[PDB]
Structures are given as structure tokens and as C-alpha cells.
Structure 1
Amino acid sequence: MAKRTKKVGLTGKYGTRYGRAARKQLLKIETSQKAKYTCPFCAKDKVRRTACGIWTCRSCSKTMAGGAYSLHTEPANAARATIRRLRLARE
């Protein structure tokens, strides 16, 4: 196994073309794009990206409006708790 030793395996599908910076950046983003994250309600890692932004989990049969390349984009993940902070403070 380990057919291509270099870590550029998902993006080995490109070959010699497209530079060395773009191929590496793509490897991280592409792997995140097809990754199975865990849908909140299903709590099972069955989610994929239907199209950029909307992701759905086969088991939970629910569509979560997540990020383009990951179920939970890093900035929103924080905003989540900041709304919770203001709200818990309000009452």
C-alpha cells in the first residue's frame, strides 16, 4: 500500500501539473471536503458535502447549513458560544 509515498495522495489525481503550492493546499482542503464529520442530531459520522455549504448525514436524514469545506467553520464555532454567552447573561 502507500502507493505514492509523498503525502500528496488525494491530490495525486492531478499529476506533475498545477505547481507545488496549489497541490499541497488542495490536499488539505480536498480531504476536508469529502470527510465524514459527525452530524449533531445523528451523532454518527455519516455527513458528506452535497454541494458547497450544505452538508447532510445519511442516517440523520437532516441537512446542516455548514461551511463550504467543513461541517463547522472555525469562526462560526466560536460565534456559537458568543451568542450563548450574551443570551445566558440576558436572562
Structure 2
Amino acid sequence: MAKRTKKVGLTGKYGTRYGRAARKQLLKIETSQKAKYTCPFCAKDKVRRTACGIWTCRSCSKTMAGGAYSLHTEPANAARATIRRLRLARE
């Protein structure tokens, strides 16, 4: 277990190549891209990436637009809230 002691957990493939900075950055993006996210409908952690921006929940069978490497991006989470607050305020 813990076959890779350091943060070469998904970046073991690159081997001794590309430099530490690129591999560290890839750890975060790669782990996020192949992670399972919770579908806002199925409520099951089954959302996986099909392409950059496209995420599908295997059980809910629903495709949703998202960030390239995460189902939900921080800017988007804030925008949904701003649009909700402004909408509720207008009505």
C-alpha cells in the first residue's frame, strides 16, 4: 500500500520527467478530473467527466455542464448565488 510515498500518487506515470511544479499541478487537476462527484439529482457520487466541461451521472443518466476538471467551479458557485439573490430581490 502507499506504493508512492510522496505526492507522485497519480503522477507516477510521468516518471522522472516534466519537473516537480508540473507534476504537483497535475496531481490536483488529474485527481479532480477522475474523481466521482455528487449529481444534483441522483444525489449519488456517480458523476464522472466525459469531456472538458461535460459531466454525466452514471445512475441519474443526466449530463451537466461543469468546469473542465471539476463538476462545479468556484466562480460558478458564486454566480449562481448572485443570480439567485438578484432574482429573489427583483420579485
Which structure 2 residues correspond to residues 71-86 of structure 1 after superposition, within 5 A? 71-86=71-86
> TM-score by structure 1 length?
0.98
Q: Tell me, which stretches of 5 or more residues in structure 1 are unaligned?
A: none
> TM-score by structure 2 length?
0.98
**In structure 1, how many angstroms separate the alpha carbons of the residues matched to 2:3 and 2:88?**
52
Over aligned residues, Cα RMSD in angstroms? 0.6
**In structure 1, how many angstroms separate the alpha carbons of the residues matched to 2:85 and 2:44?**
28
Secondary structure, counterpart of 2:50 in structure 1: strand
The CA deviation at 1:44 is: 0.4
**In structure 1, how many angstroms separate the alpha carbons of the residues matched to 2:13 and 2:21?**
15
Identity, % of aligned pairs? 100
The number of residue pairs the alignment matches comes to: 91
Runs of 4+ in 1 over 2 A off after TM superposition: none
Q: Tell me, which stretches of 5 or more residues in structure 2 are unaligned?
A: none
The CA deviation at 1:65 is: 0.4
Secondary structure, counterpart of 2:89 in structure 1: helix
The CA deviation at 1:7 is: 1.6
